[PDB]
RNA sequence: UUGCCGUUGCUAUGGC
């Protein structure tokens, strides 16, 4: 570096970059709420309210800048909850059941403007101004309900025969919704204007999970392509982040002197700032990813442990224990609890991971943003975690959070899930503090 | 898999086209040039005026079949094992063998013409 | 319905103006409908409807979006003073005709 | 000029069942029989040399 | 494009008959266009083989050529050698066109049904409705060939024949 | 030697499961145990994917007998829940078969996996 | 002798040693992702073009960013377009198959003789090669 | 704390 190091073009662009407007939504702010070790762990108030609905599916919450959450079930029922009382269970405000009354009388695609659901409402999203909630599922519709009445004020179809929506995310502090349809599509809607802005294509299996933050960017992940993409929606472009853990070379890394293996399906995302995200995979991987690297920065190989081995009384039907124990092939058929719900508090140091391992796991990323660590475990949620999110209260130095998570006995998309070891269906609420 | 005979070898040496590189240049593919034992016996019988051709046919890259029939008549050996199987290319320059091979169907035919090889009954050369 | 999106809003007070680029998103519509779009821009900002103008409309292949150049004013007086005559005879209120001869 | 070559190919793979015996796709259902005759005099195989 | 050396031999006439009938092509100029650029491609791969190992030309242009052939789709993921580029041939290149790919993906009952679907604008790969059948869809665009959103075989309104029949059955 | 003998390890398992999902998307897949034996004795089958951890194992050990009869490759995949997820259904399947189609956009994938498990066997 | 100002002696030419083979290898082994588009929006005349080339989409990004940066639609300047646009579409439809160009493998340009084998730091002494290695 | 049924708290759990 010399004494003269100016470029005429660059000082011109900084003149224009001073002259412009909108230093508002484009905040490329990294993690600033560095509170990973500051809060406690082992004294969270774990209140599990068991609710009377088979197979809840997702939770949308709300904070302004009273407080309500929302739930949605496989029994075609949305139910609104007050959660503004921070130390008790949520309370039921309005149920809302769809069913056979709202199957259309036409069986044709454009006139799917029936005012309710009839099959498997999959995700829900409450507006940042709270006026509306939106929810959708395998009835190829998005239904927008009012807050104060829970009426469908608009029904927008996805308009094709495989238009199952599978994840919804409002971008923060705006009225724009990104819904990740199983047509390898992302549809964007303006909810105060009731319009569709952009459809945008590009995944290779069904776009199972979506997440958004303060900017117009988005992060989506598809099931078995094992890639996670992020989208610039004004520029309509994307970055693709493949996986890339080879079990043979990880065996070689241990064989320098071990049940870790390949990758099936990336399941869940949550965007942690405007420069990183975390993806939860099918072999229990949790991976932390930059914006400047294809391959992930950090991988946690197994995050929720390994499924119990199949019983010798239920493996073959031979008479002797020796041959029934022979038919397990040793460790060859042990499979892990796949991380199936992942959530980040925005711009924070902590995140939450959940499956049917029975215990949620709170983790904190390191300060340098190159690794993460288990903080603690939350052993009050028996069952599959179909959604995790966090509600906050209190100012910057002292704050108190309640993890609202939904627990069912079956996965949110297909069933596939046996060995219900005493699981129940309801809302887990863990109030952690400081 | 390109079955060569003796006047293909002699014409390639008289034109200075290499065997494997000339076949790769002609077909734009890969080639296994093959010398049957009767073609090799015909080259050895042709005398010591053809020692150059003999030790250019003894090449490591040129693989070699082993024909099991009495005597050393290369044209009947090539015609029999080519109408047997329909998977070979016949590389030759005999007028008689070229007329036999271009009368039987589905057998391509390579020949030294000009200053590199030409190929006749193969319909995908470009 | 027709939705609008402003980008790269800069302020040019030397011409007493604020200029920007407009993404016009119309699903299954014909095209932008420049007048109705100017009313929508007059509503989404402070009003100044006869002071706002958009001129650089380019649709894309297959419809869906269009990209244009919007420029909102204050003070319709300087809108007349600075916005040129061809745009004013398109949209606004100046009109000039020429003695075509030779 | 496309539906010409659509049909002079359907003629072409109908003439091909007269020279060769073209692989149809395997046994349809139950095996009924040969349906066209068994000739015990004719042997259609390639003798060697 | 350019005609072959011997264009009228009976082997080549049966070749063109079989390719046109199997892939639903219109004339010989599709085969000659595709085979012209394929001749250029494996003419390049031949010279990249005629220079030996460790050469900057062979190394960089070889990995460039096989990676962009995989990305076009005519090569597989696991043949990353510069001799499968020589083993390439014409029907690998015209198995990738949108007409064949619609027929394979089951949006039509024939290759000619696929051809008329594409030229009557019911097939849209990604966003754009494609009208031409000779498209060479790539490996990434392979899975997003689907019926257009403006198409009565997709989710849109019936066409003029069906809704004129609805009008005539209304009167 | 256990009863579910050619158990495909991690790489071959996700390879198999990717071609199973693509065949189910293109309607070339027939899923279930007695559907698999129906298509195995019918003849529309390239290769057949059984699970290695169903609740008994002999419920689908009835299949490799038909496979060695009719020269069809068979592979035990280590999770029936994963195989149901791959097939794309809402219940864990234990056996699936890839029906023979020639107009198929995934023939090279099906054939590469078939050759790999023929080497495995 | 004496000093003369020369923009061609401190000008960003930077195109005498860009080769698509080398940039393709750098993009493969970069480990930074590459901003691909949504998969439909890249084909052009409903397919009647190509998809479009990488040089085409970077040039198009430059034209629309210059467009959104100083507010000006371009023109139909006929000599310029009658050469460059018809020659551009003709080399595109001859060489670019499936959105990937293949003319770089059928054109004579020596890769080592402009792109590798550095010229100033040629290390023309054994002491220099030992020092620069260590 | 709900579809029910039970232990109930005078609030937690467990079986479908
Ligand atoms: Zn012989």
From Swiss-Prot, chain A:
Keywords: Acetylation, Coiled coil, Nucleus, Phosphoprotein, Repeat, Ribonucleoprotein, Ribosome biogenesis, rRNA processing, WD repeat. One of its GO terms (biological process) is endonucleolytic cleavage in 5'-ETS of tricistronic rRNA transcript (SSU-rRNA, 5.8S rRNA, LSU-rRNA). One of its GO terms (molecular function) is U3 snoRNA binding. WD repeats lie at residues 116-155, 160-199, 202-241, 261-299, 335-373, 380-426. The keyword NAD does not apply. The WD domains are required for nucleolar localization and U3 small nucleolar RNAs binding. Present with 5130 molecules/cell in log phase SD medium. Involved in nucleolar processing of pre-18S ribosomal RNA. Required for efficient pre-rRNA cleavage at sites A0, A1 and A2, and biosynthesis of 18S rRNA. This is Ribosomal RNA-processing protein 9. It comes from Saccharomyces cerevisiae (strain ATCC 204508 / S288c) (Baker's yeast).
From Swiss-Prot, chain B:
Residues 1-99 form the PINc domain. GO terms for biological process: endonucleolytic cleavage in 5'-ETS of tricistronic rRNA transcript (SSU-rRNA, 5.8S rRNA, LSU-rRNA); endonucleolytic cleavage in ITS1 to separate SSU-rRNA from 5.8S rRNA and LSU-rRNA from tricistronic rRNA transcript (SSU-rRNA, 5.8S rRNA, LSU-rRNA); endonucleolytic cleavage to generate mature 5'-end of SSU-rRNA from (SSU-rRNA, 5.8S rRNA, LSU-rRNA); maturation of SSU-rRNA. One of its GO terms (molecular function) is RNA endonuclease activity. Keywords: Nucleus, Ribosome biogenesis, rRNA processing. It is found in: Nucleus, Nucleolus. Its main location: nucleus. The keyword rRNA processing applies. The keyword Nucleus applies. One of its GO terms (cellular component) is nucleolus. Interacts with FAF1. Belongs to the UTP23/FCF1 family. FCF1 subfamily. Essential protein involved in pre-rRNA processing and 40S ribosomal subunit assembly. Required for the early cleavage steps of 35S rRNA at the A(0), A(1), and A(2) sites. This is rRNA-processing protein FCF1. It comes from Saccharomyces cerevisiae (strain ATCC 204508 / S288c) (Baker's yeast). The chain holds residues 64 to 189 of 189 of the full protein.
From Swiss-Prot, chain D:
Primarily required at the G2/M phase. Essential for viability: involved in nucleolar processing of pre-18S ribosomal RNA as part of the ribosomal small subunit (SSU) processome. It is found in: Nucleus, Nucleolus. The chain holds residues 561 to 609 of 610 of the full protein. Residues 1-18 have a biased composition (Basic residues). This is Something about silencing protein 10. The gene is SAS10. Interacts with snoRNA U3. Interacts with MPP10. Component of the ribosomal small subunit (SSU) processome composed of at least 40 protein subunits and snoRNA U3. It comes from Saccharomyces cerevisiae (strain ATCC 204508 / S288c) (Baker's yeast). It comes from the Eukaryota. When overexpressed, has a role in the structure of silenced chromatin. Overproduction causes derepression of gene expression at both HML and HMR, as well as at the rDNA locus and at telomeres. Belongs to the SAS10 family.
Swiss-Prot record, chain G:
Residues 125-134 have a biased composition (Basic and acidic residues). Residues 78-134 are annotated as: Disordered. It is found in: Nucleus, Nucleolus. It comes from the Eukaryota. Coiled coil: none annotated. Component of the U3 small nucleolar ribonucleoprotein. Required for the early cleavages at sites A0, A1 and A2 of the pre-ribosomal RNA. Participates in ribosome biogenesis. Present with 1430 molecules/cell in log phase SD medium. This is U3 small nucleolar ribonucleoprotein protein LCP5. The gene is LCP5. The chain holds residues 224 to 357 of 357 of the full protein.
């Amino acid at each position: 570096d010399e004494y003269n190091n100016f470029d005429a073009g660059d000082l011109d662009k900084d003149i224009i970059a001073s002259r412009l407007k909108e230093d508002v939504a484009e905040q490329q702010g990294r993690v600033f709420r560095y509170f990973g070790d500051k809060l406690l762990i082992s004294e969270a108030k774990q209140s599990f309210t068991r609710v009377g609905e088979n197979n809840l599916t997702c939770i949308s919450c709300f904070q302004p800048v009273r407080l309500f959450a929302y739930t949605v079930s496989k029994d075609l029922q949305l139910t609104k909850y007050d959660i503004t009382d921070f130390s008790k269970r949520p309370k039921k405000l309005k149920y809302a059941k769809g069913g056979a009354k709202y199957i259309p009388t036409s069986k044709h695609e454009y006139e799917n403007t029936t005012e309710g659901h009839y099959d498997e409402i999959l995700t829900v999203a409450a507006s940042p101004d709270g006026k509306y909630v939106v929810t959708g599922g395998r009835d190829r519709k998005l239904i927008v309900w009012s807050t104060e009445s829970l009426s469908p004020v608009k029904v927008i179809p996805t308009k094709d025969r495989r238009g199952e929506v599978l994840s919804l995310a409002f971008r923060k502090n705006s009225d724009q919704l990104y819904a990740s349809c199983a047509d390898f599509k992302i549809r964007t809607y303006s909810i105060n204007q009731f319009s569709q802005l952009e459809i945008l294509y590009g995944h290779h299996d069904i776009v199972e999970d979506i997440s958004a933050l303060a900017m117009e960017r988005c992060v989506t992940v598809g099931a078995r392509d094992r890639t996670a993409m992020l989208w610039k929606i004004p520029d309509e472009t994307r970055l693709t982040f493949r996986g890339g853990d080879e079990p043979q070379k990880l065996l070689r890394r241990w064989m320098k002197e071990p049940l870790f293996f390949c990758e099936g399906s990336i399941d869940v995302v949550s965007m942690v700032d405007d420069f990183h995200f975390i993806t939860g995979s099918d072999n229990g991987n949790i991976c932390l990813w930059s914006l400047a690297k294809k391959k992930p920065i950090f991988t946690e190989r197994i995050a929720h442990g390994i499924l119990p081995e199949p019983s010798f009384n239920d493996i073959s039907g031979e008479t002797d224990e020796e041959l029934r124990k022979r038919q397990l092939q040793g460790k060859k058929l042990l499979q892990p609890f796949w991380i199936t719900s992942l959530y980040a508090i925005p711009y924070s140091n902590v995140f939450i991971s959940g499956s049917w391992s029975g215990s949620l796991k709170v983790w904190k990323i390191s300060d340098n943003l190159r690794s993460f660590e288990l903080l603690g475990e939350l052993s009050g949620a028996k069952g599959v975690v179909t959604k995790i999110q966090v509600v906050e209260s209190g100012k910057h130095g002292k704050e108190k959070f309640r993890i609202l998570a939904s627990i069912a006995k079956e996965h949110r998309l297909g069933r596939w899930i046996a060995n219900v070891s005493g699981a129940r269906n309801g809302i887990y609420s863990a109030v952690i503090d400081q | 898999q390109v079955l060569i005979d003796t006047n293909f070898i002699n014409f390639s040496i008289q034109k200075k086209v290499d065997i494997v590189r000339g076949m790769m240049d002609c077909l734009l593919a890969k080639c296994n040039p093959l010398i049957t034992d009767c073609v090799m016996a015909e080259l050895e019988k042709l005398g010591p005026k053809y020692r150059i051709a003999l030790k250019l046919a003894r090449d490591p890259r040129i693989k070699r079949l082993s024909c099991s029939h009495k005597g050393t008549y290369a044209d009947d050996c090539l015609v029999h094992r080519v109408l047997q199987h329909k998977c070979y290319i016949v590389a030759t320059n005999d007028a008689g063998l070229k007329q036999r091979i271009r009368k039987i169907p589905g057998i391509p035919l390579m020949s030294v013409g000009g200053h590199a090889y030409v190929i006749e009954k193969l319909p995908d050369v470009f | 319905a027709v939705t609008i999106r402003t980008r790269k809003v800069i302020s040019n007070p030397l011409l007493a103006r604020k200029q920007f680029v407009v993404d016009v998103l119309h699903p299954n519509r014909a095209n932008v409908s420049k007048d109705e779009l100017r009313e929508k821009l007059a509503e989404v900002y402070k009003a100044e409807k006869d002071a706002v103008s958009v001129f650089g409309f380019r649709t894309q292949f297959g419809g869906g979006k269009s990209v244009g150049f919007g420029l909102v004013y204050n003070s319709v007086a300087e809108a007349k003073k600075f916005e040129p005559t061809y745009r004013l005879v398109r949209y606004g209120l100046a009109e000039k005709v020429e003695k075509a001869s030779r | 000029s496309r539906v010409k070559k659509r049909k002079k190919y359907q003629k072409a793979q109908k003439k091909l069942k007269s020279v060769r015996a073209v692989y149809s796709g395997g046994q349809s259902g139950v095996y009924e029989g040969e349906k066209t005759g068994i000739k015990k005099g004719l042997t259609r195989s390639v003798k060697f040399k | 494009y350019s005609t072959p050396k011997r264009p009228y031999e009976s082997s080549r006439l049966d070749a063109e008959l079989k390719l046109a009938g199997e892939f639903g092509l219109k004339n010989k100029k599709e085969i000659y266009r595709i085979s012209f650029q394929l001749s250029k491609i494996r003419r390049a791969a031949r010279d990249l083989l005629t220079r030996d190992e460790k050469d900057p030309k062979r190394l960089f242009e070889g990995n460039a050529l096989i990676r962009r052939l995989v990305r076009v789709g005519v090569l597989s993921e696991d043949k990353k050698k510069l001799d499968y580029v020589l083993a390439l041939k014409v029907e690998d290149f015209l198995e990738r066109r949108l007409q064949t790919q619609v027929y394979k993906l089951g949006l039509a009952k024939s290759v000619h049904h696929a051809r008329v679907l594409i030229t009557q604008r019911h097939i849209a790969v990604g966003k754009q409705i494609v009208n031409i059948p000779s498209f060479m869809v790539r490996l990434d665009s392979e899975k997003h060939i689907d019926f257009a959103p403006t198409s009565p075989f997709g989710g849109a309104r019936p066409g003029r024949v069906a809704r004129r029949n609805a009008a005539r059955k209304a009167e | 030697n256990p009863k579910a003998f050619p158990l495909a390890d991690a790489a071959l398992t996700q390879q198999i499961l990717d071609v199973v999902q693509q065949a189910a998307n293109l309607r070339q897949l027939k899923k279930g145990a007695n559907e698999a034996t129906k298509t195995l004795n019918r003849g529309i089958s390239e290769f057949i994917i059984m699970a290695a951890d169903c609740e008994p194992i002999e419920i689908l050990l009835h299949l490799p007998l038909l496979c060695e009869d009719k020269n069809v490759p068979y592979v035990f995949v280590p999770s029936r829940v994963a195989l149901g997820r791959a097939c794309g259904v809402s219940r864990p399947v234990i056996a699936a078969s890839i029906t023979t189609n020639d107009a198929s956009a995934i023939k090279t994938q099906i054939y590469a996996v078939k050759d790999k498990i023929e080497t495995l066997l | 002798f004496e000093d003369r100002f020369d923009a061609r002696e401190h000008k960003d030419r930077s195109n005498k040693s860009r080769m698509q083979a080398m940039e393709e290898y750098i993009r493969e082994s970069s480990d930074q992702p590459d901003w691909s588009a949504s998969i439909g929006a890249d084909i052009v005349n409903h397919g009647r073009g190509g998809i479009k080339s990488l040089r085409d989409t970077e040039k198009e990004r430059r034209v629309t960013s210059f467009e959104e940066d100083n507010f000006t639609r371009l023109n139909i300047t006929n000599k310029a377009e009658k050469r460059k646009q018809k020659q551009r579409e003709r080399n595109a439809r001859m060489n670019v198959i499936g959105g990937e160009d293949f003319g770089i493998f059928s054109s004579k340009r020596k890769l080592e003789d402009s792109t590798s084998r550095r010229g100033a730091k040629k290390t023309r002494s054994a002491w220099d090669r030992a020092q620069r290695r260590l």
